Design a binder for this molecule. Sequence first.
Ligand SMILES: O=C1CCC/C=C\CCOC(=O)c2c(O)cc(O)c(Cl)c2C1
Length: 210
Amino acid sequence: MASETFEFQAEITQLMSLIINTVYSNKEIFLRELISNASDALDKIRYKSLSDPKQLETEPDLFIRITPKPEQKVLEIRDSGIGMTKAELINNLGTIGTKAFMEALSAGADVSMIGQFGVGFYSLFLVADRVQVISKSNDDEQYIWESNAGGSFTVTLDEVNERIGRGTILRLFLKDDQLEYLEEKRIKEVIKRHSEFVAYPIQLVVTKEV
Ligand SMILES: O=C1CCC/C=C\CCOC(=O)c2c(O)cc(O)c(Cl)c2C1
């Protein structure tokens, strides 16, 4: 399609570079962050569906799903949440207080606190050097947001990915040194830690050779 290129907010780019380059160790935190946004995005659709039940028909199942793809060194975190339009993709992930968090870090804050600054999405750059956010809102076509921690991101109408009913997929392209997060044991372990009080089911997609 006709990919559109956009510029990142000065701060957001800073945060990303800070993270993608950090020598931090507890990198497994990205998972609780992403699952956190996933769960939030799932709340918003279930809330909206209270007055507008027909909103749940595009995908009557509320779930969070992690799918490892070893060949492509990719880890997808999917949720059947409310999804984002072309514009929402552009605002949410490239506009909207990331400055406060960076200040906290410069004071000695815990990277794992990023979530309390409402910017945990960018924690994905701890384990991935490239991300593809594929989203589908009831109010728009399926789109593909894409960033590489660089200063600019792209937005392209989705015509290459599976049709998700309604929701969002974070297609993380893991770094070579972080390929451990493709393994069922490693993934299962991390999720069973910081993710205990989630209302929605968390499905893990495994490929078992018969
Ligand atoms: O802004 C957000 C999360 C905050 C929740 C606000 C509105 C719900 C829609 O937001 C989303 O689609 C969403 C998602 O499903 C998974 C994610 O990992 C991220 Cl980062 C987002 C974008």
